[PDB]
Design an enzyme around this catalytic site. Structure first.
Site, short mmCIF file in Angstrom:
data_model
loop_
_atom_site.label_atom_id
_atom_site.label_comp_id
_atom_site.label_asym_id
_atom_site.label_seq_id
_atom_site.Cartn_x
_atom_site.Cartn_y
_atom_site.Cartn_z
N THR A 96 27.66 9.11 -8.40
CA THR A 96 28.45 9.22 -6.85
C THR A 96 28.25 10.61 -6.74
O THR A 96 28.00 11.54 -7.24
CB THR A 96 30.00 9.16 -7.96
N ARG A 97 28.64 10.22 -5.21
CA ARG A 97 29.02 11.59 -4.31
C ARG A 97 29.85 11.19 -3.45
O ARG A 97 30.19 11.96 -2.65
CB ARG A 97 27.87 11.00 -3.31
N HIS A 152 37.57 5.69 -5.99
CA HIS A 152 39.28 5.14 -6.04
C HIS A 152 39.15 3.99 -6.86
O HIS A 152 38.44 3.78 -8.16
CB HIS A 152 38.78 4.54 -4.61
N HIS A 178 36.21 1.83 -8.08
CA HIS A 178 35.01 2.41 -8.69
C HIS A 178 36.18 2.16 -10.54
O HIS A 178 35.04 2.50 -11.44
CB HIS A 178 35.07 3.64 -8.30
N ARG A 189 26.50 -2.06 -5.01
CA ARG A 189 25.83 -1.76 -3.76
C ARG A 189 25.40 -1.02 -3.13
O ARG A 189 26.09 0.39 -3.24
CB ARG A 189 27.13 -3.09 -2.94
N1 LIG Z 1 32.48 -1.66 -3.97
C1 LIG Z 1 31.33 -1.50 -5.08
N2 LIG Z 1 30.72 -2.62 -5.47
C2 LIG Z 1 29.58 -2.55 -6.21
N3 LIG Z 1 29.23 -1.36 -6.77
C3 LIG Z 1 30.00 -0.03 -5.54
C4 LIG Z 1 31.22 -0.17 -4.94
N4 LIG Z 1 31.17 0.90 -4.59
C5 LIG Z 1 29.72 1.85 -4.86
N5 LIG Z 1 29.38 0.86 -6.07
C6 LIG Z 1 28.69 1.94 -6.59
O1 LIG Z 1 28.69 3.38 -6.92
C7 LIG Z 1 27.74 4.02 -6.90
C8 LIG Z 1 28.30 5.43 -5.94
O2 LIG Z 1 28.52 5.08 -4.91
P1 LIG Z 1 28.87 6.27 -3.85
O3 LIG Z 1 29.48 7.32 -4.37
O4 LIG Z 1 29.98 5.27 -3.18
O5 LIG Z 1 27.74 5.84 -3.54
S1 LIG Z 1 26.16 6.44 -3.89
O6 LIG Z 1 25.70 7.24 -2.57
O7 LIG Z 1 26.40 7.54 -4.87
O8 LIG Z 1 25.32 5.86 -4.50
C9 LIG Z 1 26.62 3.38 -6.67
O9 LIG Z 1 26.29 2.41 -7.86
C10 LIG Z 1 27.27 2.09 -5.49
O10 LIG Z 1 25.98 1.19 -5.86
CA LIG Z 2 25.21 -5.07 6.01
#
Ligand SMILES: Nc1ncnc2c1ncn2[C@@H]1O[C@H](COP(=O)(O)OS(=O)(=O)O)[C@@H](O)[C@H]1O
Ligand SMILES: [Ca+2]
Ligand SMILES: Nc1ncnc2c1ncn2[C@@H]1O[C@H](COP(=O)(O)OS(=O)(=O)O)[C@@H](O)[C@H]1O
Ligand SMILES: Nc1ncnc2c1ncn2[C@@H]1O[C@H](COP(=O)(O)OS(=O)(=O)O)[C@@H](O)[C@H]1O
Ligand SMILES: [Ca+2]
Ligand SMILES: [Ca+2]
Ligand SMILES: [Ca+2]
Ligand SMILES: [Ca+2]
Ligand SMILES: [Ca+2]
Ligand SMILES: [Ca+2]
Ligand SMILES: [Ca+2]
Ligand SMILES: [Mg+2]
Ligand SMILES: [Mg+2]
Ligand code: NA
Ligand code: NA
Ligand code: NA
Ligand code: NA
Ligand code: NA
Ligand code: NA
Ligand code: NA
Ligand code: NA
Ligand code: NA
Ligand code: NA
Ligand code: NA
Ligand code: NA
Ligand code: NA
Ligand code: NA
Ligand code: NA
EC number: 2.7.7.4
Lengths: 510, 510, 255
Positions: free
Chosen positions: A195-196, A200, A203, A289
């Protein structure tokens, strides 16, 4: 699982007894020195601690091109993201193979000694297209053409010390340290969550579901190295993570900060992330996703399919040697007050709800009220505090060039006018005199929440020194944020336009 | 009552038809120009609008000395505070009697034309002693010796326009305008209330009691020109006044801003204030405890007796021609929940309560809770908002000269450390390079609530350019706010001392 | 006035009976609303009685009941007008209604949900929540299935120590019943008291009737286990995580 390549390449451990020696060489007046760029500091740290096993230095042309066109190192090892040492022509010209370069941090702390294998000039267009999919707006591509050096220096490393960090000393666990952490706890099944962004409610549920599905403990492994431009700084996110970790049942999750420099390379990065998490001791890795995806470009088109990463990871499944827990869109169910994977509902028989990141900033910038179901209160509090609503944000009004009125009197008028509003904001007439040492301070004030009244524009050759964030141009021009009727419009009139404009954009609330 | 001297000297009215002519002369390349200093802008405005009737210019030596030693103008008219145009030797030397000088504001707006009567060099020691009582810490005396010019220019004025103000255009009523205000309302009895501080419950009661005693309407006539150093800015105070005015019964009070430049001259100023309010249309003037007094000096001794002003005003009673409503200490009565003059209670039979201004700032700076009885909630809100508690205040840490460690690394360490605390504060490593254009910005940031980490001291010749407010020195010296053990003390140690020091002083709260 | 009657939930017949009883007690009128004295629907979802059978039956005995019946049709809520009213004098789609069935009512009570200010008075819901607390304050039991191969003693301790670290006012106990009905019959007492019980062994099937199945979960490899295990010898920490997350998923634990 066994570190990628079979051997954890912890060079700090490996080179321990050469510490003093290497340190002496690194500071010898004869050796050539290169000061590591920010992204390089992130990469160098993952190489020296074993996070990038089997890597033991920056990719030479042979391994580099094999990764660009084959998603593998020259020896066949699965590796999707090219890790190279990019330098400029001037520096590149001073080195030949067999040469030893001292790599420093802040032109002061010697990090490692790189023994040169080769110096080449990559075709950035191929790397851009084959590795990041070619779109010029893609974060990795923009970096590659606007920040990265045009020459790469392949070579092996000898560690002196991992890059210096004064924040979160206890949390930046190395692969070796994390593994010990898990062991002391007898954790043999651990699903890691990349995650970056701040976490919430969705998650939290996603990660717990994974812990339950995999029958494993949870590892929150956020990136604090370098992410997508415009992301929430890591300090705020760490505060959010430490806060949300408390919503997990006692002793089910562990937090560790990953000093990784992301490329926002969707599917390729997902593969890369999994390899990295395996090196760090995880037995499972989540891939939701649009994993590691940078969303859409200015035209509204996706940089990656919402599930490309999952597909790519699935196809390397048998050689990743770390189990992937895939997730489809996790959304909210009003009528049942709970979240759930979108792949196991819908049918219209149930109504869902989703507050995209976009919409999220909007409330944060407009003082909106973020739903109790969306995120925890303690989390939003931390977020609002780091990204205050407009009424607490800073800004600048630049008196355009076309201005015919007295810039001095118009400045005073605006100052006196803003001062009577009150609200804790600090104001100042700011004369930059085209001096970059003053220009570079503009965003600092804005960041501090202050309002700046700038009587003159800065020469176009310096426009780059100033962040355009919350900087408005008062001018008769069509490209003026606050357009004037005439260049000699009377002050009270101009003042009213500026006040009402700022009021309309939420900076002022009465 | 009749304006002091019998004729309201509203020169803007008087010279109206000479407006264009005087304006042309004021902008003629041949005339000598003097740019009015801030205090002079305040005075010049009170002379041109009739507020200082009978004055029609800045006192010549004859009238000036008569005021210093006689509390009267040469013609016997009662006048306690000398109003003069102070300039420097360089300028004084270019003028002789009969000369016409153009008086400007911001070297741009022509205010008036002064016809020279004389140029003299006052004995500031006498003025200091006879007019302000001699104590070197007295605000008027410190101004007289450190800011005022050493030469005075007596001469008559011809008004072009009152000094420019872009804030509160409707509230800065002139004597003529106020009189009309009162008339349109059929107010023939009006008791004026002077002030330079925010009004709290005691004041509201004080003013109402006065309205009731005098059977007159209330005129809140606060000073927004220049008051005691360290006072609450007038913008905040105006917000407070506008807020508290609503606690008066409908149509009993009127608010008008007075652009006066106080001298904090206790009793003499009281007399002066009364004359001024009379010119403005008031029929009654309040004079409470330590009216226009600057409190005590560093030794704890009173600049004036708590009732010297009342005594002085009393002795000029028959010629002030404006009735004075005197008040003794107005304090709070817990047991009865109400305020009352101290001269009509005590006897120990009743317990009182009083929150001095001192104690007031303390709560404001410490986030303390100000009593519901002391001041209205809406008022404290406005105050806290303008003078935030330590956890929202800015500050600077200056790495002392004796520092032996790496200033660069210690700076980053402090930055990274402060960043992990969160709380909305913005931080920055600030390199001033001894450039005053950078130094003068230090208090701006602190004022904006930001925290600055300054790696080096500034030469002593520039120390004056920086406000010492919330600026701490980290050094081994005894004069260091944060004293180090040794010049080479290890960073993590220095960091802990700095963090805990700031935490002890309320800047950080966990 | 409290009526010590023993109902039969006999819909229409009971309605007639109720009216006769209320007449004996001095009433001159008796209300008969929707599904009066009706037990709802059976497991198949079919009504035991028509929503107005009682009213029809009472109507047909009208002249000999000698007590006047005040019949009522479904009384529902009117959002747009903030007021209730008989359903027989509205609808037409021209007005939107709202109804929180008893079912849905228990759900909020069991899930800590917030019962609408319009539905019931605050003082009433307070009393209800207090008698029927939400899951996070409810009791429960985990029965270590027979198929369990691990040390029942150590698994019990593990669960106890694990639950203890959560806190929340709940009292825990490893409970050995020894197939003694005098101990078995106490199980629901604890659950009723809000306590959490860890039971290391099952009780013989011949005594299963002595224990109320309320909030009693079976940890076993069997398909009929509420908490299904991978293998009979699954390592304790693994079993512990499954039990914790299961209870967390069913609201017993909230973090
Ligand atoms: N609503 C969601 N449904 C399924 N997976 C999610 C959802 N939101 C975030 N994720 C997953 O949570 C992980 C990290 O999310 P983010 O911090 O937003 O983005 S990421 O750039 O690190 O992938 C990733 O595997 C991402 O696909
Ligand atoms: Ca799209
Ligand atoms: N507690 C008090 N009792 C009597 N008079 C008071 C009291 N407080 C303030 N005053 C009067 O209120 C007027 C203005 O008060 P301040 O703003 O504090 O100071 S002043 O410099 O303008 O006099 C003065 O006449 C002052 O003496
Ligand atoms: N929404 C409703 N509309 C009309 N009548 C109702 C409604 N709810 C309850 N009643 C009536 O209220 C009386 C008692 O209600 P309940 O306690 O729920 O059930 S009963 O078993 O005693 O009939 C009955 O006459 C019933 O039909
Ligand atoms: Ca280039
Ligand atoms: Ca024009
Ligand atoms: Ca001097
Ligand atoms: Ca005293
Ligand atoms: Ca030493
Ligand atoms: Ca039915
Ligand atoms: Ca087995
Ligand atoms: Mg490091
Ligand atoms: Mg004015
Ligand atoms: Na393995
Ligand atoms: Na340096
Ligand atoms: Na698995
Ligand atoms: Na795709
Ligand atoms: Na394998
Ligand atoms: Na708009
Ligand atoms: Na100028
Ligand atoms: Na003397
Ligand atoms: Na009188
Ligand atoms: Na005295
Ligand atoms: Na008179
Ligand atoms: Na202390
Ligand atoms: Na029926
Ligand atoms: Na009958
Ligand atoms: Na579930």
């Amino acid at each position: 699982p066994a570190p990628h390549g079979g051997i954890l390449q912890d060079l700090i451990a490996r080179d321990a007894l050469k510490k003093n020696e290497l340190l002496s060489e690194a500071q010898s007046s004869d050796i050539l020195v290169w000061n590591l760029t920010p992204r390089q500091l992130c990469d160098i740290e993952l190489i020296l601690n074993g996070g990038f096993s089997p890597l033991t230095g920056f990719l030479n042309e042979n391994d580099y091109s094999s990764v660009v066109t084959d998603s593998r190192l020259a020896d066949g090892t699965l590796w999707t993201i090219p890790i190279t040492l990019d330098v400029d022509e001037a520096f590149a010209n001073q080195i030949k193979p067999d040469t030893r370069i001292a790599l420093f941090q802040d032109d002061e702390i010697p990090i490692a000694i790189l023994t040169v294998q080769d110096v080449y000039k990559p075709n950035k267009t191929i790397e851009a297209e084959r590795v990041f999919r070619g779109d010029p707006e893609h974060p990795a591509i923009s970096y590659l053409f606007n920040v990265a050096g045009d020459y790469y220096v392949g070579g092996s490393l000898e560690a002196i010390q991992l890059p210096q960090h004064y924040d979160y000393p206890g949390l930046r666990k190395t692969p070796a340290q994390l593994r010990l952490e898990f062991q002391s706890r007898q954790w043999d099944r651990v699903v890691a969550f990349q995650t970056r962004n701040p976490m919430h409610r969705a998650h939290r549920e996603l990660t717990v579901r994974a812990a339950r599905e995999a029958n494993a403990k949870v590892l929150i492994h956020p990136v604090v190295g370098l992410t997508k431009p415009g992301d929430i700084d890591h300090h705020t996110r760490v505060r959010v993570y430490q806060e949300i970790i408390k919503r997990y049942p006692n002793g089910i999750a562990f937090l560790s900060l990953l000093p990784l420099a992301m490329r926002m390379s969707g599917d390729r990065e997902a593969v890369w992330h999994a390899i990295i998490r395996k090196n760090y001791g995880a037995s499972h890795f989540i891939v939701g996703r649009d994993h590691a995806g940078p969303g859409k470009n200015s035209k509204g088109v996706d940089f990656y399919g919402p599930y490309d990463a999952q597909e790519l990871v699935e196809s390397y499944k048998h050689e990743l040697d770390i189990e992937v827990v895939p997730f489809r869109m996790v959304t909210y169910l009003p009528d049942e007050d709970r979240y759930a994977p979108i792949d196991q509902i819908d049918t219209t028989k149930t109504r869902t709800l989703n507050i995209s990141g976009t919409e999220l900033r909007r409330r944060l910038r407009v003082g909106g009220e973020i739903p109790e179901w969306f995120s925890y209160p303690e989390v939003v509090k931390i977020l609002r505090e780091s990204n205050p609503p407009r009424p607490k944000q800073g800004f600048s009004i630049v008196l355009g060039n076309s201005l015919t009125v007295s810039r001095e009197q118009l400045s005073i008028a605006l100052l006196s006018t803003f001062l009577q509003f009150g609200g804790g904001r600090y104001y100042k007439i700011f004369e930059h005199n085209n001096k970059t040492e003053l220009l570079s301070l503009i965003q600092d004030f804005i960041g501090s929440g202050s309002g700046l009244i700038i009587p003159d524009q800065w020469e176009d050759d310096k426009d780059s020194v100033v962040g355009k964030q919350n900087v408005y141009l008062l001018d008769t021009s069509s490209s003026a944020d606050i357009q004037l009727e005439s260049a000699d419009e009377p002050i009270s009139h101009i003042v009213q336009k500026v006040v009402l404009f700022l009021e309309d954009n939420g900076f002022f609330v009465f």
